[PDB]
Design a protein around this ligand. Structure first.
Ligand SMILES: CCN[C@H]1C[C@H](C)S(=O)(=O)c2sc(S(N)(=O)=O)cc21
Ligand SMILES: [Zn+2]
Length: 256
């Protein structure tokens, strides 16, 4: 089934998911000299003070930190969005080496990793309904570069040893996602898709301009995770990123 290796990787996904060759696929390269500054674009409103994290899980493709989304606790509003989008989970994509790992690129520059905070439009009532709609999800993407340690990331790094292999999960309460935000919330936005199967074209992408920095030893611990389940041959979970897709009939807008 799908993965990131030679035999089941991104170049093969269209055989099982024909929308892989669709008109609003993600990620894309953001060319900064062609993005249009749009003065109509409102500031983002990130209200994460009431976030309740529950669990961290290795799902064989990345690891997800899951949030309670039964009520409007942690939400995203404003920017290009109409309505309220609830945070349900975040995960990362990263590389085997510091010069690759992000899915979006900026003037073809690749970063060491990319954080995706996934939110769904509450007017559709549940998550499963929201992914079937063109404005169902909003994903906030943040680039990670290697430099100084990010204090707010260390609790995540410390629990990775307990979810080394696919299917493992651990309780992960009281984690505050505000510790993962850059100082500035300036952004680019465009209409796109999920970057993994099922590749549904339901996402409004909001990619922040400012990277956060993490240390070398923090990103090193991501690279020790396993794609495989326990008792199977070890394959290190690295390079779980999709390459940039054609922009086609789309415009990237900048808030700045
Ligand atoms: C491993 C499958 N992950 C898929 C399906 C999940 C149900 S989701 O939350 O819709 C989601 S969000 C993204 S991404 N990389 O575009 O942010 C990929 C996925
Ligand atoms: Zn992602």
């Amino acid at each position: 089934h799908w993965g990131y290796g030679k035999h089941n990787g991104p170049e093969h996904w269209h055989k099982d998911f024909p929308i892989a060759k669709g008109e609003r696929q993600s990620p894309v390269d953001i060319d900064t000299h062609t993005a249009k500054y749009d003065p109509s674009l409102k500031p983002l409103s990130v209200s994460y003070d009431q976030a309740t994290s529950l669990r961290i899980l290795n799902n064989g493709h990345a690891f997800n930190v899951e949030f309670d989304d039964s009520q409007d606790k942690a939400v995203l509003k404003g920017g290009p969005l109409d309505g309220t989008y609830r945070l349900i989970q975040f995960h990362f994509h990263w590389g085997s080496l510091d010069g690759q790992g992000s899915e979006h690129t900026v003037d073809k520059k690749k970063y060491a990793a990319e954080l995706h905070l996934v939110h769904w439009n509450t007017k559709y009532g549940d998550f499963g309904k929201a992914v079937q709609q063109p404005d169902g999800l909003a994903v906030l993407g943040i680039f990670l570069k290697v430099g100084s340690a990010k204090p707010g990331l260390q609790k995540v790094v410390d629990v990775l040893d307990s979810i080394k292999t696919k299917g493992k999960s651990a309780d992960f309460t009281n984690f505050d996602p505000r510790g993962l935000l850059p100082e500035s919330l300036d952004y680019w936005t465009y209409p796109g898709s999920l970057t993994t199967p099922p590749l549904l074209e339901c996402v409004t992408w909001i990619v922040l301009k400012e990277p956060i920095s993490v240390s070398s030893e923090q990103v090193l611990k991501f690279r020790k995770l396993n794609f495989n389940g326990e008792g199977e041959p070890e394959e290190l979970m690295v390079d779980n990123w999709r390459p940039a897709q054609p922009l086609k009939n789309r415009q990237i807008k900048a808030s700045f």
